[PDB]
Design a protein around this ligand. Structure first.
Ligand code: NAD
Ligand code: NAD
Ligand code: ADN
Ligand code: ADN
Ligand code: K
Ligand code: K
Lengths: 475, 475
C-alpha cells in the first residue's frame, strides 16, 4: 500500500494512507465525541490541571475514530503524543488523516505489511532528539515487547539471531539489530525515563504477568483490561456489536438457522455468542474451563468439541487468546464456504500458515480481507481478515459509546501512572474510579441512580458515594 | 401451627409438622438425587475416607428437598447432624418428615412464629450431653449470631437487657436469658470446640465481615456464597427459575406486557430481571451502584428511581440485602393490586410493619402467604410471604440442579473447615475445587469439555487440569 509521509522539513513526522480523508475523519470524530460522554467529561474535569503536561506519550492501539478521541483527550491534558496501530488491518484511514491534520504524529494505515507494522511501532517510540516515551498506551503488548526486547538485546545481542521459528520475530529482530547499529544503547537510554504502560487487553495483561513472574518487567503497568468497566463492557457488549457487524460486512451471510461455533466462552466468547444469537443463529460453544462451560449451558447453548460440529457449523469464531484453536485438519473437514474468523488475538488462533501452505490449495480474494480457500477435494472455506481480529479488520471495531468506558479508563490510568509512585508490578485502578467511569455514562442513557439514605449507608457499611462492592466482587 | 415432637424416650429429638408426609418427601428426594450429580458424586468420592466421622454438625438453612440431599450427603460422610430452617416460611414439610423418618433431628415447619423460629435454632445447636456443634452450616447468619451473642452475653449479661428497639432481638434476648439460667456458661463451653461455619448467602457473609471488622468473630468462616459456582449460578439462575415460579403460584398474574420493577441489579437482581423478561414483562431496574446500573442499561432495561414508576409498575421485587427499599409512602401510591415481594433478605426490604400499622388499612388473606392490603382510598396492594423470601415462601426455592452447585460447595467447605487449620478470618474455597464443582455437572448436561494440548497449556502458562483463570477473574 502506497503511503504518504510528512513533507521534508515538516514540523513533525507521520506516515498514513491519504491526508485528503481528514475532513471526513473529522466529521466522524465530531459525531463520536457526542457518543463518548465519559471521555469528554474526563477531558473537561482534568483540563485545568494539565496532569500530563509535556509528557512524551506513545500509543500502540487500533487507529480508529474512537482512538482519535482518546488521543485528543490525552493531548487536551497536556501530553506530547505519537501513535501507531496495534494491528495491520484495524486503522481507519480517515481517523488517521484527521489526527495528522490536527498536527499529531501517526504511523498507521489499513493494510500494512508486517515489516511496515513494526517500522511504524519504532517511529512511534522514537521521539525527537533520540528520546523515548515517558508513558505508553498499549493494546496487546507489542510496544511493550519491543521496548523490553530492545533493552535485553543490548545486553545480549545474540537474541537478535534467534527467531524461534517465527517470521514475525525475525522481522522484529532485524529491526532491533539495525537500531543497535544506528543508535547504540538507545533502549538503555530511554528505559529509565519510561515511567509506565497502561495495557488495554486480556492478552497484553497476560504478557505483563509472564514478564513480572520471570522478573523481567522493566517499568510499572496499569492493567486497564481488568477495570470492571472495561472487561465487563468492552469485551462483552463491544463484541456483541462488532462481531456480527464484521461478519455481515464481509460476507452478507444470513446467520439465522445456521450453526455457529464460538470457541471460548470468556468475556469475548460471551459477547460473541450473544452477537450471533440475536440473529437467530444456533450457537454451539467450546471451552476448556468447566465453569465457563457450565455458564454456556445455563444460557441454553450446546457445549461441544470442535470436531463434533465440523459437519454442521457454517461459522467458526475463535475468542480464546490461545493458539491452535482451528487446525488445518479441522478446515479440511468443514462444510463448503464455512466462514472462519478470529476475534481473540494475533493470527495463531487459526492455523492460517498451514492453510496457506496446504498442498494444492487455491486462494481467491473475494474482496480485501475476505479470502476463499478452495481445497483439492472441491470444498472451500472463507477466511476473514487473514485470521486477525475480525471486528476491527472487516468492520470498525467496537462502537464509540462502549469505547468511552475503555478509553476513560486509559486516560485515568495514564494520569495515575504519571502522578503516583508505582513500584515494579501490575496494578488496577481503584474501584471508586472504576465506578466513576460507569457513572459518567448514565445521564446520556436517561438512567437515574438511587442515592443511599443515611440509614441505608450505615446498614450496609458503605459510603453514599461508593465504593459499593467488596474488592473481590465479580459483577 | 400444631407440631409433632418426638415420643417421650425417643432415641432423638425433633419437631416437625407431620411425619405422615415422609413417604411423599422420600419420593421427591429420590428424584432430586438424580438432579444433583455434584452432591451424589461427592458422596462416592469421600465415602471411604469418612472425612466428617462423628462431627457434631448443626445446620440452619431452608429445610427443603434439596437440603435433605445435603443433610444425607453430610451424614454419608460421617457427620452427626441436627437441622433447622433459616426462614419461617421456607421449610418443605414433606422434606422435613422424610429426614426425620430416616432418623435425623429436624426442628422446622412451614409457618413458624418468630418465637418458634428461635426455639428451633436453640434445639438444633444444643447437642446431647449439653454439647454444641463442632461445625455449622449457616444461611443468613442467624445461628452464627446466636452463638456470638450467647458467648458475649455470658461476659456481660446486661447485653440481654438491650432489645435495640427490635421485637425479634427481644425474642433472642429472652431465650438467651433462659439458657443462662438453665445452662450457665454453655456458650463459653461450646465455642472452643466449634471449628468453623460455612455461610451460604450474601447477607450472611456481610455479617461475617462486620464481625471481623469489629474483631469479634469467634471461629473461622468459609464464605460459600462467593464460590464462583455458587454466586454466579445459584444467585443468578436460581432466581431466574424460582422468582417467577413464586409469583405465578401466589397470584397467577400474567407478566406479559406489565411493567415490573426490580430493585437492585446484583446477582439476584440480574437473575430476577431475567425471570420476568422471559415472560414478556417490561422490566425497569433501580440501583445505587453505577456499574450495575450500566449493566442493566446494556441489557436493554430502563434504569429508574422507584418514584417514577409508581403509576406504571404492577410488580415490585426487592433484591438488595438492604433496608427500606419499598416504603409505606411508595405503597400508598401504587397501582391497584400491585404485587409487592422480596427475594433478598429478612423482612425489612419492604416496610411491612408500617404497612400493617397504616391507619385504616384492611388486611385480607387471599390464601396462605398472599395478603391483600386495602387502603382507605380503595386501592390495594398484594404482599407476598409477609415480605420474606418469596421464592422459598410462595414456591419451593431454587431447583435441585442449581442447588447441587451450592451444596457441593457446602460439603467441600465443611470438609475443609474440619481438616484444615484455618485462623480467625473469612475464607473461600480454592479455585481448582470451585472448578471441580462445575465439572461434576457437565456430564448430565451432555456438555463436552475440550482438553488443552501440551502446547496450549504451555502457551497459556496453566495446567491442563486447571486452575484455568487468574485469582481475580470475574467470569
Ligand atoms: N477483538 C476485540 O475487540 C477484543 C476485545 C476484547 C478482548 N479481546 C481479546 O480476545 C481474547 C479473549 O479475551 P477474554 O477477555 O475473553 O479472555 P478470557 O480469559 O475471559 O476468555 C478466553 C476463554 O478461552 C477459553 N479457552 C482457552 N483455550 C481454549 C481452547 N483450546 N478451546 C476452547 N476454549 C478455550 C478459556 O477457558 C477462557 O474462558 C484475548 O486475546 C483478548 O485480548 C479482543
Ligand atoms: N432468595 C434467594 O434464594 C436468594 C439467593 C441468593 C441470595 N439471596 C439474597 O439476596 C440479596 C442480594 O444478594 P446478591 O448476591 O444479589 O447481592 P449483591 O451485592 O450482588 O446485589 C445487591 C444489589 O443491591 C443494590 N442495592 C443496594 N441498596 C439499594 C437500593 N437502596 N436501591 C437499589 N439497589 C440497591 C446494590 O448496589 C447491589 O448491586 C442478599 O440478601 C442475599 O443474601 C437470596
Ligand atoms: N473501535 C475500537 N477502537 C479502538 N480499540 C478498539 C475498538 N474496538 C475494539 N478495540 C479494542 O481492541 C482490543 C483488542 O486488541 C480490545 O481490548 C478492545 O478494547
Ligand atoms: N431450594 C432451596 N433449598 C435450600 N436453600 C435454598 C433453596 N433455594 C434457595 N436457597 C438458598 O437460600 C439462600 C437465601 O437465604 C440463597 O443463598 C440460596 O442458596
Ligand atoms: K467503531
Ligand atoms: K425446589
Amino acid at each position: 500500500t502506497q503511503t504518504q509521509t510528512q513533507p521534508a522539513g515538516n514540523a513533525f513526522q507521520y506516515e498514513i494512507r491519504d491526508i485528503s480523508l481528514a475532513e471526513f475523519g473529522r466529521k466522524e470524530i465530531n459525531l463520536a465525541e457526542h457518543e463518548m460522554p465519559g471521555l469528554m467529561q474526563t477531558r473537561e474535569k482534568y483540563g485545568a490541571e494539565q496532569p500530563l503536561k509535556g509528557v512524551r506519550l506513545a500509543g500502540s492501539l487500533h487507529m480508529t475514530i474512537q482512538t482519535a478521541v482518546l488521543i485528543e483527550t490525552l493531548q487536551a491534558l497536556g501530553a506530547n503524543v505519537r501513535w501507531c496501530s496495534c494491528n495491520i488491518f484495524s486503522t481507519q484511514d480517515h481517523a488517521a488523516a484527521a489526527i495528522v491534520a490536527a498536527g499529531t504524529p501517526v504511523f498507521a494505515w489499513k493494510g500494512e505489511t508486517l515489516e511496515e507494522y513494526w517500522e511504524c511501532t519504532w517511529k512511534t517510540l522514537l521521539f525527537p532528539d533520540d528520546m523515548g516515551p515517558q508513558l505508553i498506551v498499549d493494546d496487546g503488548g507489542d510496544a511493550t515487547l519491543m521496548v523490553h526486547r530492545g533493552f535485553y538485546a543490548e545486553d545480549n545481542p545474540s537474541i537478535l539471531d534467534d527467531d524461534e521459528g517465527s517470521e514475525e520475530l525475525a522481522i522484529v529482530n532485524k529491526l532491533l539489530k539495525r537500531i543497535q547499529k544506528e543508535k547504540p544503547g538507545y533502549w538503555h537510554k530511554i528505559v529509565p525515563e519510561l515511567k509506565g504502560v497502561s495495557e488495554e487487553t486480556t492478552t497484553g495483561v497476560h504478557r505483563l504477568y509472564e514478564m513480572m513472574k520471570e522478573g523481567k518487567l522493566l517499568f510499572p503497568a496499569l492493567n486497564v483490561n481488568d477495570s470492571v468497566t472495561k472487561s465487563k463492557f468492552d469485551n462483552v457488549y463491544g463484541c456483541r456489536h462488532s462481531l456480527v457487524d464484521a461478519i455481515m460486512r464481509a460476507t452478507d451471510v444470513m446467520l439465522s438457522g445456521k450453526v455457529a461455533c464460538v470457541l471460548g466462552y470468556g468475556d469475548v466468547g460471551k459477547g460473541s455468542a450473544e452477537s450471533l444469537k440475536g440473529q437467530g443463529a444456533r450457537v454451539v460453544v467450546t471451552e476448556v474451563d468447566p465453569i465457563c462451560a457450565l455458564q454456556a449451558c445455563m444460557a441454553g447453548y450446546e457445549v461441544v468439541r470442535i470436531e463434533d460440529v465440523l459437519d454442521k457449523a457454517e461459522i467458526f469464531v475463535t475468542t480464546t487468546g490461545n493458539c491452535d484453536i482451528i487446525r488445518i485438519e479441522h478446515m479440511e473437514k468443514m462444510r463448503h464456504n464455512a466462514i472462519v474468523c478470529n476475534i481473540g488475538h494475533f493470527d495463531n488462533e487459526i492455523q492460517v500458515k498451514a492453510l496457506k501452505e496446504f498442498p494444492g490449495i487455491k486462494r481467491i480474494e473475494i474482496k480485501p480481507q475476505v479470502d476463499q480457500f478452495v481445497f483439492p477435494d472441491g470444498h472451500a472455506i472463507v477466511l476473514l481478515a487473514e485470521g486477525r481480529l475480525v471486528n476491527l479488520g472487516c468492520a470498525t471495531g467496537h462502537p464509540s459509546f462502549v469505547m468511552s468506558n475503555s478509553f476513560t479508563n486509559q486516560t485515568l490510568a495514564q494520569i495515575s501512572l504519571w502522578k503516583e509512585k508505582y513500584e515494579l508490578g501490575v496494578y488496577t485502578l481503584p474501584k471508586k474510579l472504576d465506578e466513576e467511569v460507569a457513572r459518567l455514562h448514565l445521564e446520556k442513557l436517561g438512567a437515574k441512580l438511587t442515592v443511599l439514605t443515611d440509614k441505608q449507608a450505615k446498614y450496609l457499611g458503605i459510603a453514599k458515594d461508593g465504593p459499593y462492592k467488596p474488592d473481590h466482587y465479580r459483577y
